[PDB]
Each structure stands twice: as structure tokens, then as C-alpha cells.
Amino acid sequence: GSSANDWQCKTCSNVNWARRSECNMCNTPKYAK
Numbered sequence: 001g002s003s004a005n006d007w008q009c010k011t012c013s014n015v016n017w018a019r020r021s022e023c024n025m026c027n028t029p030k031y032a033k
């Protein structure tokens with residue numbers, strides 16, 4: 001989650017898919033900030 005491809009949730013700190021739109025655990029949008 002430091003490369004512009006695979007991202008990491010800001011809530012659970014778990015990396016979803018290498019291009020997911022949102023978290024499946026927290027339902028956090030990719031980058032809602």
C-alpha cells in the first residue's frame with residue numbers, strides 16, 4: 001500500500017484488492033480523504 005496500484009485501508013489497515021474501489025471490511029472508499 002505504498003505503490004500507486006495496491007492500496008491499503010485506512011481503517012482496518014488491511015490491503016484489499018490491488019485496485020479495489022472500497023474496503024470489504026470497513027466499507028471505506030479507496031481514498032475518501
Ligand SMILES: [Zn+2]
Pocket residue numbers: 009010011012013014023024025026027028
Ligand atoms: Zn478496512
